[model samples]
Target: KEDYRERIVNEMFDTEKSYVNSMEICIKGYYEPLIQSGHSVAPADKVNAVFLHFQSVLSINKELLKNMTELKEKGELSTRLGEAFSQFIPMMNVYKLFLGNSDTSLQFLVELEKSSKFNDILDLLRSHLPGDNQLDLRSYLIMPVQRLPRYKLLLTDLIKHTDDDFVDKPKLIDALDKISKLATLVNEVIKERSRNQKLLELV
Candidate 1:
């Protein structure tokens, strides 16, 4: 149950859960199905990168998921999720391709677009509640990629309302920096996308 007293915390927690929940749905509804159907991201590293991201999401979200699990649809606000953000950094260091870098996974997804199984993934994605709602795989995939800014914005106040001299404040600040860097990479990708779209249009 939401406290409703801490509005930003409630909203932030909701966004965090929604963001992570969508990724989980994609894993269960889309990624696993694609692999089971014998379609995988071309280069093996990319496969690892993609799966690693999904797994990392769950790892980082363990606390939030646990808290929410106590009662169905009930949620507890946690600054613990900020600490979890640090966990995401190492995953990016290992394989950041899914974030914004040029890599095999995106190309693999584009090619997969032509397949019937991939079509079914798209179908599953279409029904995802609170999901990207955009039919484009890139857009949907990037929702997770893009939420760092939301985290930053949400945390600014939550962190402020957070009691002064808190032990984890430094950790939260550090995690915020890490998330901002990830968001920065995403911004460059928007430029890259815009340029490619024009080139493709011309061709």
Candidate 2:
């Protein structure tokens, strides 16, 4: 007889697996081909696929939140999801910036492209990690890689230009601040987990 906690965790894992499998097909079967063709610069259906996946996972998360027993296990899960959402905002900022500022410098262009690609990969990995029961830990662990590039890109550009000309500057800064807060939370959570493990060893 499975406990409620085990059953909930299993359901979450299954949802994660389903999302990953769908995303693999979207990337390989859909997005890769679009990139290989001359449509790389054009907006593809891939974005819609990604949006739908996010919505689906968010819905599942909401369902999990509704379960009273699962609410007890939510501290770590909430932090992880928050971290993922924090990184996502920056990525979206990059997209918005690029859309508005096509005439920006080459350096900015390169950085924006790289940031977009990195976020795409990170999102896929995030969607997959929940299946392995490491979503909370892994989300925090991956924060630096997920956010550092965008921070470096934007901070460097900010240093170069003092003017508030960029439309996305405020949005980008807000996202960066959120990410920093989440990173701090991640570090604290990991340390707390480590302490718990050591205490368990003594028992």
Candidate 3:
């Protein structure tokens, strides 16, 4: 049973690494090129709207991953693992910002698709041979939205497999509570946004 704790920590660490990887690609492969497209393909505001606060989310996760690595290096992975998450509670707001901007971002993409210049740039990106062909702008953009819920699930699993007498149990539980509440808040906002959209459609 104790081995499960180690497994979960490794899982979190690995997933965090991949998450950061996707965000870096999104920034470098898509965002930077789009911005450097002479502002003709998409003016600054439109491009910014499509990727609102994405950098902030990336920055926070990078720090979290670094902290997790430090813990692992010190051989204190399980004992102080929860502290890494707890330290980032305030930064979780960046996810909220990214999530809230999601609708506008999608709308911007929809508008951009009509632009041949944008399509040409997108085609250039897809022409890259090595990366996953299915992963596109929308996929990368939505990754951060999915990440918090993933964290909540991982924390729940970690807590369940954790020993009752573990020193980090309370810390893990505290981390879970904050993540759970934030996840709930994010869902409620999404529900309310959809309801408003529906009402507008009726009008």
lDDT of 1 by residue, 1-203 (tens): 22332687568667767766666666666556555554442344444444546555555555544554443344323545455555554554422544544333455555555567756656665575344553444554666556656777776766666664566567667766766666555565665476446446553
Provide the RMSD of all predictions against the true structure, rounded to 1 decimal.
5.3, 22.5, 3.6
Question: Against the unseen true structure, what C-alpha lDDT does each candidate score?
Answer: 0.56, 0.38, 0.80
Whole-structure CA lDDT of model 1: 0.56
Predicted model with the maximum lDDT: 3
Error of 1 at 44 (Å): 8.5
Reference-based TM-score of each model: 0.64, 0.24, 0.85
Clashing pairs in 3: none
User: What TM-score does model 2 achieve against the real structure?
Assistant: 0.24
Q: Order of candidates by TM-score, top first?
A: 3, 1, 2
Error of 2 at 199 (Å): 5.0
Instruction: Kindly list the per-residue Cα lDDT of model 2 for residues 60-138, writing each as its tens digit.
Output: 3334333422433564431132233333544443332322222222223233335666446545544654245334323
Candidate 2 runs further than 4 Å off = 1-163, 181-187, 190-196, 199-201
Given candidate 1, what's the lDDT at residue 63?
54
**Cα deviation of 60 in candidate 2 (Å)?**
13
Largest TM-score belongs to which candidate?
Answer: 3
